[PDB]
């Protein structure tokens, strides 16, 4: 594969992930979008060079490396018009930085308006020598990364501004109801051997209940975080969350189906739709024949624990936090609201507005969107989830950061002591109260917002401007990032 220095060149092409012809974006000549790789401490430097002409899925982007703290490296994150301006088409830009302190499954995209459901989203393994799950597993490469996705046959501007599926992409490959003959995704195993499968949800706005016929699965890591092992025999994987499970290949030579139950759409499997094949090696080269058995154990995010059971940053109690920020969910005007507020682009990025004057919130665009916080402080926030708003649950998310949920959906019990950590939380049904604390450690601008990529279009963001007064000193900027600006203005309405 590629990794951790490579050329990224995203453009358009056609492509048939479900046997429907269309033109979408590829990156480095490919779709899906490629894995990239590297080793803990490893330096990424990333050179994304963009050549796509295609004004309706748009000429511009910008990637966000999904999970990376990226401290002293805001510049680098990705948002446009957060973090930086977008990459004009003709151009190249540099995404220089260090994984000193992270290891784990994370995930790349386009974070330009809805670009990555058309295709700019790719997976990222950043391994580490000394895993302490190193020894639960055989198997651990290209091959047991597995992405889930959602495709549509009409382009992300083309289509409803909340749209729904037509297929599951299983590693880039599904079938439609018109389409039910196009080709599976097949995962190989050895009999006898045990995999750490890497599940990555890819999606825009669906979030799959996944599962494999005959098959347990050990949960070991969420998101990027070392967990405790934790046997489900089925995984809700929300968008832009990641599970790591060991599969332990001990059954009968065979195929099994891999199912993926998305929450809208087509929610069943007739014909193979959310489906994929587990093969053993040796087992003939056809559509399994296994039945689906209900699921006793499913994964329940409140039961996990970190591996090191590390506790919430904060005291043990509500508003044990040197700010608290309840998030109060809307929507009208066909606009999502957070307190008020509806979230649109600033014409200056966030980062540029800090390193040129801005001292505080208010000083900042777009106002009532950013929240000031203070330095080596202990944040809580809240989500309380609602009707008020459509399209729940909402897997919300924050960059720059883990953060420990204290609280997840479905449950009541608030966790102090050993919560899970992670980057993707779902906010759930309307009833829940989703808490999520972590410490201030990262002087920047970081984007927290709805992943459900419709959603964040229409404003479900806030923007986090974390120890302002420091942000100018630990983010150094590349020349070419402060030439992004002025050359994104200069641009044209279609060559954007
Ligand atoms: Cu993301
Ligand atoms: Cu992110
Ligand atoms: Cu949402
Ligand atoms: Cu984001």
């Given at each position: 594969?590629?990794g951790?220095?490579?050329?990224?060149?995203?453009?358009?092409?056609?492509?048939?992930?479900?046997?429907?012809?269309?033109?979408?974006?590829?990156?480095?000549?490919?779709?899906?979008?490629?894995?990239?790789?590297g080793?803990?401490?490893?330096?990424?430097?990333?050179?994304?060079?963009?050549?796509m002409?295609?004004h309706?899925?748009?000429?511009?982007?910008?990637?966000?490396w999904?999970?990376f703290?990226?401290?002293?490296?805001?510049?680098?994150?990705?948002?446009?018009?957060?973090?930086?301006?977008?990459?004009?088409?003709?151009?190249?830009?540099?995404?220089?930085?260090?994984?000193?302190?992270?290891?784990?499954?994370?995930?790349?995209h386009?974070?330009?308006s809805?670009?990555?459901?058309?295709?700019?989203?790719?997976?990222?393994?950043?391994?580490?020598?000394?895993?302490?799950?190193?020894?639960?597993?055989?198997?651990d490469?290209?091959?047991?990364?597995?992405?889930?996705?959602?495709?549509?046959?009409?382009?992300?501007?083309?289509?409803?501004?909340?749209?729904?599926?037509?297929?599951?992409?299983?590693?880039?490959?599904?079938?439609?109801?018109?389409?039910?003959?196009?080709?599976?995704?097949?995962?190989?195993?050895?009999?006898?051997?045990?995999?750490?499968?890497?599940?990555?949800?890819?999606?825009?706005?669906?979030?799959?209940?996944?599962?494999?016929?005959?098959?347990?699965?050990?949960?070991?890591?969420?998101?990027?975080?070392?967990?405790?092992?934790?046997?489900?025999?089925?995984?809700?994987?929300?968008?832009?969350?990641?599970?790591?499970?060991?599969?332990?290949?001990?059954?009968?030579?065979?195929?099994?189906?891999?199912?993926?139950?998305?929450?809208?759409?087509?929610?069943?499997?007739?014909?193979?739709?959310?489906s994929?094949?587990?093969?053993?090696?040796?087992?003939?080269?056809?559509?399994?024949?296994?039945?689906?058995?209900?699921?006793?154990?499913?994964?329940?995010?409140?039961?996990?624990?970190?591996?090191?059971?590390?506790?919430?940053?904060?005291?043990?109690?509500?508003?044990?936090?040197?700010?608290?920020?309840?998030?109060?969910?809307?929507?009208?005007?066909?606009?999502?609201?957070?307190?008020?507020?509806?979230?649109?682009?600033?014409?200056?990025?966030?980062?540029?507005?800090?390193?040129?004057?801005?001292?505080?919130a208010?000083?900042?665009?777009?106002?009532?969107?950013?929240?000031?916080?203070?330095?080596?402080?202990?944040?809580?926030?809240?989500?309380?989830?609602?009707?008020?708003?459509?399209?729940?649950?909402?897997?919300?998310?924050?960059?720059?950061?883990?953060?420990?949920?204290?609280?997840?959906?479905?449950?009541?019990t608030?966790?102090?002591?050993?919560?899970?950590?992670?980057?993707?939380?779902?906010?759930?049904?309307?009833?829940?109260?989703?808490?999520?604390?972590?410490?201030?450690?990262?002087?920047?601008?970081?984007?927290?917002?709805?992943?459900?990529?419709?959603?964040?279009?229409?404003?479900?963001?806030?923007?986090?401007?974390?120890?302002?007064?420091?942000?100018?000193?630990?983010?150094?900027?590349?020349?070419?990032?402060?030439?992004?600006?002025?050359?994104?203005?200069?641009?044209?309405?279609?060559?954007?």
């Open positions: 594969s590629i951790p220095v490579a050329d990224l060149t995203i453009s358009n092409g056609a492509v048939s992930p479900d046997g429907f012809s269309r033109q979408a974006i590829l990156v480095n000549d490919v779709f899906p979008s490629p894995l990239i790789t080793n803990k401490g490893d330096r990424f430097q990333l050179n994304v060079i963009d050549n002409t295609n309706t899925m748009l000429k511009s982007t910008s990637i966000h999904h999970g703290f990226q401290h002293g490296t805001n510049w680098a994150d990705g948002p446009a018009f957060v973090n930086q301006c977008p990459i004009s088409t003709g151009h190249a830009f540099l995404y220089d930085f260090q994984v000193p302190d992270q290891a784990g499954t994370f995930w790349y386009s974070h330009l809805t670009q990555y459901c058309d295709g700019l989203r790719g997976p990222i393994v950043v391994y580490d020598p000394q895993d302490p799950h190193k020894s639960l597993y055989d198997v490469d290209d091959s047991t990364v597995i992405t889930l996705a959602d495709w549509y046959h009409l382009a992300a501007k083309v289509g409803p501004a909340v749209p729904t599926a037509d297929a599951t992409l299983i590693n880039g490959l599904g079938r439609s109801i018109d389409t039910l003959n196009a080709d599976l995704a097949v995962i190989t195993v050895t009999k006898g051997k045990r995999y750490r499968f890497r599940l990555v949800s890819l999606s825009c706005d669906p979030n799959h209940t996944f599962s494999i016929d005959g098959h347990s699965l050990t949960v070991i890591e969420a998101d990027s975080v070392n967990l405790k092992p934790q046997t489900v025999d089925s995984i809700q994987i929300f968008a832009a969350q990641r599970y790591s499970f060991v599969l332990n290949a001990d059954q009968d030579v065979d195929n099994y189906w891999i199912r993926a139950l998305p929450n809208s759409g087509t929610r069943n499997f007739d014909g193979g739709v959310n994929a094949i587990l093969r053993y090696d040796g087992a003939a080269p056809v559509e399994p024949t296994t039945t689906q058995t209900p699921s006793t154990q499913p994964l329940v995010e409140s039961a996990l624990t970190t591996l090191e059971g590390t506790a919430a940053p904060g005291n043990p109690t509500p508003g044990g936090v040197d700010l608290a920020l309840n998030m109060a969910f809307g929507f009208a005007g066909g606009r999502f609201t957070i307190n008020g507020a509806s979230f649109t682009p600033p014409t200056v990025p966030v980062l540029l507005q800090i390193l040129s004057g801005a001292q505080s208010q000083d900042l665009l777009p106002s009532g969107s950013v929240y000031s916080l203070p330095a080596n402080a202990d944040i809580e926030i809240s989500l309380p989830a609602t009707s008020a708003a459509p399209g729940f649950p909402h897997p919300f998310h924050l960059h720059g950061h883990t953060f420990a949920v204290v609280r997840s959906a479905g449950s009541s608030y966790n102090y002591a050993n919560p899970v950590y992670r980057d993707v939380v779902s906010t759930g049904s309307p009833g829940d109260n989703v808490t999520i604390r972590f410490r201030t450690d990262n002087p920047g601008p970081w984007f927290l917002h709805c992943h459900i990529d419709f959603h964040l279009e229409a404003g479900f963001a806030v923007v986090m401007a974390e120890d302002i007064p420091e942000v100018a000193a630990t983010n150094p900027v590349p020349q070419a990032w402060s030439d992004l600006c002025p050359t994104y203005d200069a641009l044209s309405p279609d060559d954007q």
